[PDB]
Amino acid sequence: MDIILGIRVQDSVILASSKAVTRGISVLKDSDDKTRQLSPHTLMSFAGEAGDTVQFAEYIQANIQLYSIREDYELSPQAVSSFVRQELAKSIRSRRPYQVNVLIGGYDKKKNKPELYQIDYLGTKVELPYGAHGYSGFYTFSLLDHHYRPDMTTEEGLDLLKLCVQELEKRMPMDFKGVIVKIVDKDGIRQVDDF
Amino acid sequence: QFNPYGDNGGTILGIAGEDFAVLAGDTRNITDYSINSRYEPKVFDCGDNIVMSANGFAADGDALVKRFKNSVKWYHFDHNDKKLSINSAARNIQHLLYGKRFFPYYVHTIIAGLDEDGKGAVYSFDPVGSYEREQCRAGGAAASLIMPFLDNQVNFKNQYEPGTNGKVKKPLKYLSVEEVIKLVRDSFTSATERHIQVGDGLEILIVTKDGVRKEFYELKRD
Amino acid sequence: SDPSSINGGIVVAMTGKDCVAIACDLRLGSQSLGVSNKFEKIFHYGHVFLGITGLATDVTTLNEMFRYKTNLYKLKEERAIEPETFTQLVSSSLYERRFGPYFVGPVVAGINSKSGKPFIAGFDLIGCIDEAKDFIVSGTASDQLFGMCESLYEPNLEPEDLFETISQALLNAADRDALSGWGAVVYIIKKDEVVKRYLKMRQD
Amino acid sequence: TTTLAFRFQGGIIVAVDSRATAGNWVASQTVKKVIEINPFLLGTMAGGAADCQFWETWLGSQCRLHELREKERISVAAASKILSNLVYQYKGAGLSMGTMICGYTRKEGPTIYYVDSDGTRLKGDIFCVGSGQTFAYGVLDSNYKWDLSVEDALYLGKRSILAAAHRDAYSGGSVNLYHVTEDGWIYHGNHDVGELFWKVKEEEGSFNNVIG
Amino acid sequence: TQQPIVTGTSVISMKYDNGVIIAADNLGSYGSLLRFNGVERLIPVGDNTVVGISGDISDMQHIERLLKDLVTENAYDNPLADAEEALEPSYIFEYLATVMYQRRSKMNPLWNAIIVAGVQSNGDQFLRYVNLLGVTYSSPTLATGFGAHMANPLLRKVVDRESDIPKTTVQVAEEAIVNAMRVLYYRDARSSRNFSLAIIDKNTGLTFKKNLQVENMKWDFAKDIKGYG
Amino acid sequence: GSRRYDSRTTIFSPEGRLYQVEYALESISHAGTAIGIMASDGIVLAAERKVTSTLLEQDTSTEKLYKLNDKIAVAVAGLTADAEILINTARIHAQNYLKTYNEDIPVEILVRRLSDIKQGYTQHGGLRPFGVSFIYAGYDDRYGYQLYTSNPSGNYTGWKAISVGANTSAAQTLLQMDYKDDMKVDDAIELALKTLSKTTDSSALTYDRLEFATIRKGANDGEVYQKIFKPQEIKDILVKTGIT
Amino acid sequence: DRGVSTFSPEGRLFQVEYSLEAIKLGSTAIGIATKEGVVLGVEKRATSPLLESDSIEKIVEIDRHIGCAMSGLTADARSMIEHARTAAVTHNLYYDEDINVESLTQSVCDLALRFGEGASGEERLMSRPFGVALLIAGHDADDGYQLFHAEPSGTFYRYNAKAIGSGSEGAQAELLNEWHSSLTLKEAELLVLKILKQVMEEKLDENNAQLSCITKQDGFKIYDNEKTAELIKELKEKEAAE
Amino acid sequence: GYDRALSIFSPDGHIFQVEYALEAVKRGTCAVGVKGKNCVVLGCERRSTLKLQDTRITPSKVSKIDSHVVLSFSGLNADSRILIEKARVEAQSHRLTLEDPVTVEYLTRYVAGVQQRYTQSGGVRPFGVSTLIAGFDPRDDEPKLYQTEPSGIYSSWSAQTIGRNSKTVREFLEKNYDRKEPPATVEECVKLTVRSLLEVVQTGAKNIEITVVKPDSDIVALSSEEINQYVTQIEQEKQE
Amino acid sequence: FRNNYDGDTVTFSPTGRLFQVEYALEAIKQGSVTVGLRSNTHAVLVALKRNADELSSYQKKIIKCDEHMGLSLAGLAPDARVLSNYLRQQCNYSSLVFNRKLAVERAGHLLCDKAQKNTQSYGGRPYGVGLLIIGYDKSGAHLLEFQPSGNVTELYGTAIGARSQGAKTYLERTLDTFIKIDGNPDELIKAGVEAISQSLRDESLTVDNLSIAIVGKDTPFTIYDGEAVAKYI
């Protein structure tokens, strides 16, 4: 639907995305990635407005991959978030507005520290311990601040996210049909297939 | 508030033959309840055995006959008198239409001629842009009064051989040009009596192998 | 809701005796939902200080913007911009985006280094230079702050006694507003050094 | 206005109706809602008629001009992402687009792509666009298998348009089938929707409900 | 969008056997306030065409200027055809039409109606109509603005169809229009007593009678109406 | 007609060379000398003015040393007017990168873009090539200290030492002997005055015909410092290597 | 420098005379048009045994019934092939019908005219050239197989057969004897190779020759390198009967 | 404004500036290319030899365009920067619109395209650059080597050489690379590419750079030690 | 041939001359001969069509501009293509806007005015082709002479091309005869053959290399060729 959730644990960014895409009266498909890999250690999730989301993904993706050819050097996650905020900021003033929210989760190798960035459509970046978007992001903020400790490893963090979805299934009326969860560990970018 | 779309009433009717074609329509031009002129051609020849009529809001209708006869000319210089196919002509308007899709023309246009094979050809264009090749299509204001009579007298649609009770659909028999002249005349006799934008006159253009033949038949003046 | 009332926050800036102090709350959220208590609103350029409140996307865009203008100034003259020609720089860039203005309110507070001189100035949307030599307030509880300041504030206060004052007026107004509530930073700026103190603010 | 297409064993079945209404008035019942983009791509007509017909002829032109240019035939996925990025330019000018571009190449297999006016471009195994988007899903999805005889797959398309045509106002007219193989689409022709109903009512024994 | 401010209203016309007779009132209204009087708006274009213009005054004077220059363009050169190729009715018309087309594309129209009325070098009678709408139609008689609902029925007694044009003489036509005018001066708020009449005859040129007034008015019956019950 | 008056800067010779460009490489060697020295422990950027008169206010002037941003300084050889254009165009480009990545421009990038500008004048548009060459001295995290030079052709190469301006061959052989790869910052200072005191065309090397600036990582908390010395501290180290 | 503008007081634009030299430098290109199949064959002139023969392209597809062979600088031609491809497809959107062969030549000839000074905003996107010829060959209902000869002049004629390139003079004199009105496809294909053998620098092989036709059913079709090796082999049998 | 014609036709059927273009290439550096049956090898000699001249941060003459395309260039080095730039631009705008990485065929046309199009406009001199383009077609194993001209012409080659003293190394390659039998392995090819350079480099291993591209975006450079090893090997064998 | 002045049309000579124009005038005499003669009901053009060698086909020398008007080229064939377009264009512009037949008188003067621009401006060559424009309107029949220079004049008869004088002389001896020819279509064509045979000196007359065009008061613009000119000849 719109549900993109983020939790940073001690050694990973975990971004999870809605399996479903509804346009029109029906649920057209129940599988469609709402993420594009930018770099080997940088991953971007996007949700929002029909049809803009795609064009504003692959426009970023090419541009950021252009830099990586030119200089043979994967940009910081710190850097990456700036490039997108700039592109958004510029686009609100224009003839077309771009309704798109982005979570950028990446692994800095300069700092060796995971970092997650949350950008809203307006054009405000904010680095967070965890974040969300839409009216959907509400149900999750309150489980997280109870059980989050700033030390968890990938397995304790993965179970925590399972609780969150479990809540989200009870209370929200829009379905979405589970999540694809993706992990940016110390190097890798792997899709866990379990819930 | 300025509104740059009017209406001028009037109706056309395209019947295809097996070597002939017929584009007919009335000569009555109107605006609300005032009759401007009782007689006023709508169905113009474009040479090369294409006949066109762009019926609806008369103001657009001349503008889309302008650019059309213009383009008929300018094909013939550059292809050095390759004769313009009824079929190719179709796909051409479709560009002229679409070209003003963000300022439409309110006309419902029909072109008609013979194709290479010698069969009749009727096309009719969506006013916005697209089009479909037909066998018969009315358009214009009293379109919805004339169409459903033609589909019962040409296609024998919902008729069956008698005694066979639904099991045998009545067979298609191809109509003579003598027969299709009478059909038109009946249609546009009835249209007058129940709709107040048909009357005065009817103009048939018949196109065959020979060329263009004209026929004017009067209707009731009311 | 207007754009300024989405992202809220307040900024207060009050002169002393040969010193100045600027302060804000750390909130950055939208409507009801709070996002972060990490957002800082106070930036600086040299020994001049700049606070900004209101539309969150215009916040970070005018920060990148001024940083670039006062970079290109410091290289040519080879010194820090004076607070008064910084005031001016602010005015012009608000006012040339007269249409589609940036939904902010900039508060400038600094010490002109050469003169020892305490210095504050205020702004709003398309750029009116509010001179004051008492205090300036901005942000989405600017009625509330105004009261407290005017009764508490006395001209001439010691850099140490100034800190008590601006303390009070920030705390009590933020929890009598909806759009401010998490945390609080105060910069006491004496002519040679910059103290940072985070207020214990009661949770909202 | 029912257009559906499903991936199956031997390739793709396209199936469409042909009643295209303008208002309450039923304009014409002969409107072929396929657009032959070349002999290995088939593109449907649903949504606004002008925006759809014209613009996939124009797609036909970039196909005969990618094809000469590299001498390698266009991929099915790549064709789609042309068309999409063109109509994205005009977004917010009331142009109305719902097509499936269907092809089968030997580098990708049978693959449907669904291009839409917002700019949304989805791969998938079943799409069905238009008035009969929910009726058509329903009949089709029970009886749908990734393994099927080509013959059975033709008979599964008939029945899907049939179902939407009965209940829906603006679906009716005639049915059309096409069968995409690697080598190209072959036309399996036109069955009247009023003869087709009565064979399948009796023969199968469904539509009890219907009188007669 | 243009707003008609200072408008004059109504122009009538019919064919007869040897030419056309066009006549229009002269009167510039400004809502209820009748602000300008005796405003000529029968324009001669050469000596074989009159162009009679109606609706907005402001827009009219900008179609009085484009006619005048249209003759200066044609008159250039053509020295062995300065009377042989001099602007036919049929030319003057098409040009106006196609300008009125072109402003309607930008949706800033010259907010008028135009009658072009003249005689060909065949002697053929000519009478066409164009207006803001972009419609054209030619006709056996013609009326503008408010005379489409009153003036048209009167002239259609004389000219019914194309059998009656040789039978209708120019004495009869003359009577018919004047009399036609009687009824307009009665039933139309925006109409006065002054009217200008032009005959373009194919055998004697432009006869231009100016500032005739209406004749024989019935108002005796009116004394005898009393209350309303 | 006007083709006669056209110089055709653009055209290739029968050598295939751009004769215009070769002329420009001249106009550098007229101008005063600047020397680049890379050390492991800092970069000493040292250039002796061409001007010399006794009425020059040395304290007030920079003319051979400009800062780009806080990490990157250039030394100029050629016409100062020409240079000043390029040097502002650099400064804006540095800042443009800072607004978009909040991450200071890497030294490779900044040099590459200056080099692209120069080239363009001699591709097309019958402009006269700039008469300028820069020494680039700059620091980042990626590669460490980096040195580069770009010439009026628009082609740049890295270096462990280099010299531009007059007596280029003379300077280059003095450095070939003397530089060892290990130097501190204080020894590097002493090799720079040594190489400038032989080549100088004027008899004496004086504190007011010199400009000296450093870029040192010996600023604590892992920060770099620039400093252009005053004409009154270059005087104190002119007696240190014994030139007076 | 001569202008593009200036006239030679003979009456001639110096530049056109110099263009028509560039044709003759480039490699041989024969075309023989018969009433049963146009055959185009060119000499590749592989310049080293290292270079791969078949990357080189001098028979080029304009659409699926207009094939084209080029002589001269192949670079100049890159622009003019692309212009021709677009225009023929533009017509097929616009009239759903094969572009006339004659018409396509005209549009190429029009771009050829362009090389102008580029005064005001007017778009002449060239300032020079187009030193290449085409053998534009095609088939349409209006006239049978045709063949047309483009110049860089902006001047074209129909031709029953025409040679161009290095051996044009020799090939021309053999063509005026051998050309006839009764040729078959199979006889014309063997005849092209025989006239191409005389003015080939090297021995007739398929590693420096490429053959093609356009025939009514097929359309364009360039031949297989295996087929060509076989037609070489059959020429020498007939010749060794004599 | 400037559009004065620089492709003044030579009456002898040529163009003065396009000859000169070919001349400027000959001045500059040398670079050799050879295609085995599962590798390509681009070696180029570097006059970046000069005590006190870095090579870490100095840019090598073999450039990366894309993940699986590599370019090497001889001729003016100021100019090289452009054609890199344009090709990079291209490589992304192809992914964007058609998906899928560039076919090596395509990118060849496209670089070639740019150089032709500078002889058309008057305001601009020709690029005096020839290039080697190498890569492996998306999801395949097909070595490809292409070379383009400052004419704009292009062709694939079994091996080629451009830059200074290209005649020595072409004459060497005719004898020592069979057209029917490529060098079998990656080491046997690399030994063959070194042996070609060491004719015009006049020994040394510090001079020459050898990069190899294999299928599946394997762009790797050989480091000084490796170079030396290979050279030494060729030394013992040759001596013996 | 240089020295003095032979550069742009801008540079103007101390002699009073402009060389480039004169050069352009030499150009027409290179091409193949064309005659044009009229009477009051018919205007004919005869031009000689030519072929590169004998496998090459002839070349189109007569161009139909419209159904009441047309030109024939002599000299440069690229130049004729630019100017024939512009008279298509303009005679279309007068049927669209004003619905008038573009008068022959007008159509000459407009072409003159376009030529002038090329000789005033820097760059641009003078157009170097000559057009004999025949045509029929309501002012009867016209023939016009376009010189490259810009001048238009109406004549009863002219020729320009290779060995034209042989045709020009014949046309003056018979001036008295062919204006009085009216109504016989055949008699007019056949006079014009015997006017173009004089020019053919060292050239044989072929019947398939001759191009013939009549326009009149009842026939549109028609080119005869192939079988149709093998009736007359």
UniProtKB/Swiss-Prot annotation, chain C:
Give one GO biological process term.
Answer: proteasome-mediated ubiquitin-dependent protein catabolic process
Cross-referenced SUPFAM superfamilies? N-terminal nucleophile aminohydrolases (Ntn hydrolases) (SSF56235)
The protein here is known as: Proteasome subunit beta type-3
Please give the InterPro entries that the UniProt record associates with this protein. Ntn_hydrolases_N (IPR029055), Proteasome_beta_3 (IPR033811), Proteasome_bsu_CS (IPR016050), Proteasome_sua/b (IPR001353), Proteasome_suB-type (IPR023333)
Return any one Pfam family short name. Proteasome
Q: Where is this cross-link: Glycyl lysine isopeptide (Lys-Gly) (interchain with G-Cter in ubiquitin)?
A: K69
Specify the species: Saccharomyces cerevisiae (strain ATCC 204508 / S288c) (Baker's yeast)
Where are residues bearing Phosphoserine located in the sequence? S30
Curated annotation (Swiss-Prot), chain F:
Question: Biological process (GO) annotations?
Answer: proteasomal ubiquitin-independent protein catabolic process; proteasome core complex assembly; proteasome-mediated ubiquitin-dependent protein catabolic process
Q: Signal peptide span per the entry?
A: none
Q: Does the keyword Ubl conjugation apply?
A: yes
A GO term from the CC aspect = proteasome core complex, alpha-subunit complex
Q: Does the keyword Transit peptide apply?
A: no
Q: What's in the keyword line of the UniProt record?
A: Cytoplasm, Isopeptide bond, Nucleus, Proteasome, Ubl conjugation
Q: Which SMART domains match?
A: Proteasome_A_N
Cross-link type Glycyl lysine isopeptide (Lys-Gly) (interchain with G-Cter in ubiquitin), placed at K99, K198, K230
Q: Which Pfam families match?
A: Proteasome, Proteasome_A_N
Q: Where does the record place it?
A: Cytoplasm; Nucleus
Q: What else is known?
A: Present with 17100 molecules/cell in log phase SD medium.
Q: What does the UniProt function comment say about this protein?
A: The proteasome degrades poly-ubiquitinated proteins in the cytoplasm and in the nucleus. It is essential for the regulated turnover of proteins and for the removal of misfolded proteins. The proteasome is a multicatalytic proteinase complex that is characterized by its ability to cleave peptides with Arg, Phe, Tyr, Leu, and Glu adjacent to the leaving group at neutral or slightly basic pH. It has an ATP-dependent proteolytic activity.
- Similarity section: Belongs to the peptidase T1A family.
This chain's protein is named: Proteasome subunit alpha type-3
The upper taxonomy is: Eukaryota, Fungi, Dikarya, Ascomycota, Saccharomycotina
Curated annotation (Swiss-Prot), chain H:
Q: Which PROSITE patterns match?
A: PROTEASOME_ALPHA_1, PROTEASOME_ALPHA_2
Note the Pfam families from the entry: Proteasome (PF00227), Proteasome_A_N (PF10584)
Single GO biological process annotation from the record: proteasomal ubiquitin-independent protein catabolic process
Q: Which domain of life is it from?
A: Eukaryota
Which controlled-vocabulary keywords does the entry list?
Cytoplasm, Nucleus, Phosphoprotein, Proteasome
The chain's disulfide connectivity reads: none
> GO terms for CC?
mitochondrion; nuclear outer membrane-endoplasmic reticulum membrane network; nucleus; proteasome complex; proteasome core complex, alpha-subunit complex; proteasome storage granule
Q: What does this protein do?
A: The proteasome degrades poly-ubiquitinated proteins in the cytoplasm and in the nucleus. It is essential for the regulated turnover of proteins and for the removal of misfolded proteins. The proteasome is a multicatalytic proteinase complex that is characterized by its ability to cleave peptides with Arg, Phe, Tyr, Leu, and Glu adjacent to the leaving group at neutral or slightly basic pH. It has an ATP-dependent proteolytic activity.
UniProt record similarity statement: Belongs to the peptidase T1A family.
The protein, known as: Proteasome subunit alpha type-4
Which organism is this entry from? Answer: Saccharomyces cerevisiae (strain ATCC 204508 / S288c)
Q: What is the lineage of its organism?
A: Eukaryota, Fungi, Dikarya, Ascomycota, Saccharomycotina
Swiss-Prot record, chain I:
Q: Which residues carry this modification: Phosphoserine?
A: S13
Keyword list, A-Z: Cytoplasm, Isopeptide bond, Nucleus, Phosphoprotein, Proteasome, Ubl conjugation
Tell me if Phosphoprotein is a UniProt keyword of this record: yes
- PROSITE patterns per UniProt: PROTEASOME_ALPHA_1 (PS00388), PROTEASOME_ALPHA_2 (PS51475)
GO BP terms:
proteasomal ubiquitin-independent protein catabolic process; proteasome-mediated ubiquitin-dependent protein catabolic process
**Residues in cross-link Glycyl lysine isopeptide (Lys-Gly) (interchain with G-Cter in ubiquitin):** K190
Instruction: Say yes or no: keyword Ubl conjugation present.
Output: yes
GO cellular component: a single term: proteasome core complex, alpha-subunit complex
Top-level taxon of the source organism = Eukaryota
List localization entries: Cytoplasm; Nucleus
Q: What is its main location?
A: cytoplasm
Q: How does it assemble?
A: The 26S proteasome consists of a 20S proteasome core and two 19S regulatory subunits. The 20S proteasome core is composed of 28 subunits that are arranged in four stacked rings, resulting in a barrel-shaped structure. The two end rings are each formed by seven alpha subunits, and the two central rings are each formed by seven beta subunits. The catalytic chamber with the active sites is on the inside of the barrel.
Its family? Answer: Belongs to the peptidase T1A family.
What other note does the entry give for this protein? Present with 7210 molecules/cell in log phase SD medium.
Q: Which PANTHER family match?
A: PROTEASOME SUBUNIT ALPHA/BETA (PTHR11599)
Protein's UniProt name: Proteasome subunit alpha type-6
Chain's gene name: PRE5
